[PDB]
Design a protein around this ligand. Structure first.
Ligand SMILES: Cc1c(C(=O)C2=C(O)CCCC2=O)ccc2c1c(=O)n(-c1cccc3ccccc13)c(=O)n2C
Ligand SMILES: Cc1c(C(=O)C2=C(O)CCCC2=O)ccc2c1c(=O)n(-c1cccc3ccccc13)c(=O)n2C
Ligand SMILES: [Co+2]
Ligand SMILES: [Co+2]
Lengths: 381, 381
């Protein structure tokens, strides 16, 4: 069931913005680890005396890394005379965010038809305003409302049809064309103390509907009309034998925030080969692999979708597989992206639901909680 | 002239500690960019609820990257019950340092015979105490005094004869054996507003002597008895046609701090080949190369030290060459290591002064200020 209840026209995920202490080092690490190209910049060299912002791209995936400069460089500016390219940026907010939460996602940005309308309708329907609509160079409108914790949902709309005015394309010499196959953001997941109030709030101001589904958590997924913007939310389940990873997140993050970004690959085997080659030379580490019992059990579960060789390739790379009533999901999780056991990345590829592929084909892998549990006990035997 | 006036027994540079917002991402970037191996850690996985600290090594060079966790994880601790492995660490100091200065060096650590004695003698001779001597596991003593700005000179002494108690050696799987030829810290350089008072202060409490030398700055070099610990200091020269890079540093750094680390390579050609291969894939960028006039002029200056092929290899890699009355210096400078135009790295190799090689052989490259100026005008013609 999809009531198509969006209160404003939503297109696709546009970008994810990380708030950093040093944007250069995080961006360079992420570029090498994920195979993303340096695409645009806004910093001292482009006249921005307020913040350093670096954009990485892979296909349609856009990761932005932003850090504040010394406020002294811009102490004579006021908002009408600002040299910031992102007018919602605030030195104090950014330092406070980073000191509270560590490295993490500040903004989940979606492209909409009209960011001013999206903002107005959102706030009229209960959204907490974070940054009012501002028109940049008569070309792009950006607005922000609170999503959960200190994460904002950012609306971006373009008059035309390059990232944002005031960003400059990066010189080709500094722009090595890395590509490990990642192509777009599939979903972005928040952790909260209480799922109910978080869902009611977000669904209330967006009109996003609950996406039909089918340890240590309860979850639900909010989706736009064409189910291409997917915003799952988790809450902890307390009292369990094993401590909830959602609760650990909330403790180390100092509350609610973005838990994981799931990045679609056009070839998850190539993506994982390339990422695993770089894990110990500056890239990202992956969660410990499931026991061989897990891959022995894949024949019964997905032997009609994956060949024995493709299954054994999943086993070499530690890839998990789950299945819906409509499609199949290949997925794997990185270790946390930074110092704290908080945000991590998921790499996914979806098989099925061809019409274009429909959103959320194969689900989100919740069946892998029981399958992992089973395969662990089976391997113990 | 070397009066050998050290007020306590100094051995060698021991490590450099960076204070970070996220130690993981900075350490992984530096590891790949410089060819340093992950050697030790102190973090949540080792029981440290206070700070995340990661040690990189290349030869005798030790770079430590430290960031604070949420204070909530350790809110019940007091100093007698701390789980920090570096007892001088303070959440507030670290956040304040990073918010003021951005990514940069907090501690220049030298190994001494007796860190408690070094501390006491230093303070008795004018050093501003920063952290009193603390004995770790009855095995290592660490103490800190102010050096300049918010940079401390850290004394470390060992009863024995592994990094520090509470650090664990890094698993081999996570410890890829990168090596681009870097072998030790040659010198560590501070920028200050006024050279005179800074020299008087540091030489006053160390007994370090002025190392015999032979644009936009005045400088002097303080040296230990065997001239193996080398601490140059720069001040800006104002009114110049071109704005002093020392003054730009002080503005963007919010005052005095560490300007550059010079890392000795056992093969600067290999080091620069390896670093330049990685500049645009997560590593470090280098300053723009000098004009070919500079390398045309190298024959007259160092043609008795470098062959034509070795000179042309300097030209391919952008390496600068200077000469003392005793030796020759090969050097090159990176672009700033992070967002701010503040700290950068120098790669150096020294030729001559064989006895072992004596410290500071060939100087610090101050002759390259005029040689670069000349070669630029000559290439314009
Ligand atoms: C994050 C995730 C997803 C997922 O993507 C998802 C949504 O997108 C939206 C719905 C809720 C939802 O969970 C799916 C399966 C997962 C995990 C996941 O994180 N993990 C864990 C990985 C590593 C260490 C763990 C430690 C304790 C507990 C779980 C750990 C799993 O095992 N499975 C099986
Ligand atoms: C840092 C340095 C050293 C050096 O290592 C040293 C000591 O160790 C101790 C004594 C003082 C001292 O300077 C030597 C020569 C240098 C530079 C240096 O930084 N630069 C610059 C590089 C790039 C952009 C510049 C822009 C403006 C002005 C100078 C720029 C140079 O050109 N030369 C020639
Ligand atoms: Co997911
Ligand atoms: Co130098």
């Amino acid at each position: 069931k999809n009531p198509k209840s969006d209160k404003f026209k939503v297109k696709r995920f546009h970008h994810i913005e990380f708030w950093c202490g040093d944007a250069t080092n995080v961006a360079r690490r992420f570029s090498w680890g994920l195979g993303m190209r340096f695409s645009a910049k806004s910093d001292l060299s482009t006249g921005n005396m307020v913040h350093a912002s670096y954009l990485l791209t892979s296909g349609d995936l856009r990761f932005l890394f932003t850090a504040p400069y010394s406020p002294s460089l811009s102490a004579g500016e006021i908002k009408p005379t600002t040299t910031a390219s992102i007018p919602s940026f605030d030195h104090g907010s950014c330092r406070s965010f980073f000191s509270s939460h560590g490295l993490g996602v500040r903004a989940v940005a979606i492209e909409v038809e009209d960011a001013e309308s999206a903002f107005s309708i959102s706030v009229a329907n209960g959204a907490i305003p974070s940054s009012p609509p501002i028109v940049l160079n008569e070309a792009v409108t950006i607005a922000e409302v609170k999503l959960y914790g200190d994460v904002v949902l950012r609306y971006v709309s373009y008059k035309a049809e390059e990232f944002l005015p005031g960003f400059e394309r990066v010189e080709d010499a500094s722009s090595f064309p890395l590509d490990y196959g990642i192509r777009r953001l599939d979903h972005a997941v928040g952790n909260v103390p209480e799922l109910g109030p978080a869902l009611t709030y977000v669904a209330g101001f967006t009109g996003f509907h609950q996406f039909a589904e089918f340890s240590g958590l309860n979850s639900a997924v909010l989706a736009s009309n064409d189910e291409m913007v997917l915003l799952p939310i988790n809450e902890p389940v307390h009292g369990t034998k094993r401590k909830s990873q959602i609760q650990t997140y909330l403790e180390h993050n100092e509350g609610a925030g973005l838990q994981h970004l799931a990045l679609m690959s056009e070839d998850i085997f190539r993506t994982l080969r390339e990422m695993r080659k770089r894990s110990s030379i500056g890239g990202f580490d992956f969660m410990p692999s499931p026991p061989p019992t897990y891959y022995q059990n894949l024949k019964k579960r997905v032997g009609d979708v994956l060949s024995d060789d493709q299954i054994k390739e999943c086993e070499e790379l530690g890839i998990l597989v789950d299945r819906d009533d409509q499609g199949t999901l290949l997925q794997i999780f990185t270790k946390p992206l930074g110092d704290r056991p908080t945000i991590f990345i998921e790499i996914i590829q979806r098989v099925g639901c061809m019409m274009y592929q429909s959103g959320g084909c194969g689900g989100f892998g919740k069946g892998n909680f029981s399958e992992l549990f089973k395969s662990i006990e089976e391997y113990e035997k």
